[PDB]
Amino acid sequence: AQNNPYLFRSNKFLTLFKNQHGSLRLLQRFNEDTEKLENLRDYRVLEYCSKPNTLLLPHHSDSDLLVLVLEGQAILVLVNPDGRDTYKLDQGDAIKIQAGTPFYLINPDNNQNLRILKFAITFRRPGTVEDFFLSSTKRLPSYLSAFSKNFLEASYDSPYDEIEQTLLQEEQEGVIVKMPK
């Protein structure tokens, strides 16, 4: 792996996560190895493969995403300041997630894998894409733990130790989690 000459054939991602139940890849930047793809600069392509009876933990992305299910089927649930929407996607269905919206994913009761292409469109950091996770795992932890004790102890009106143990996870199975049942 080094830089290049004039191309539009792009076959290699980077793994951001890989466990028991699935993968998280992200195609490299388009203008990265060429000034030829300058126009594709503000967008990123990720790949999402999950297994039967699995959940992607609740999170949000800094960018709007355009999710296309290329294989299988899933349960999409979007959270709102006052609510939730659930969507069933079977193969070939597509749907845009406004950025900032937190959502989780799930491949149903199955025998097959869900295969998802997420088209990310970037606005704050050009060509850059960030996912914020509510949970802690071994990789990165919960974004809520960045807060100082008092802050959290005040916003919540409970004592530190009681936040902690409803803060700080031991999510063995990091990002992807076989729905026990």
Binding site: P81, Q169, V177
Partner: peptide
């Protein structure tokens, strides 16, 4: 632009997570 609150009683997005969701999201 929507403001999403992570604590408190109003516009709190966490609180909007289904019981068995939390269950797996959190220690707890």
């Amino acid at each position: 632009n929507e403001r999403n609150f992570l604590a408190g009683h109003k516009e709190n997005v966490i609180r909007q997570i289904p019981r068995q969701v939390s269950d797996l999201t959190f220690p707890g």
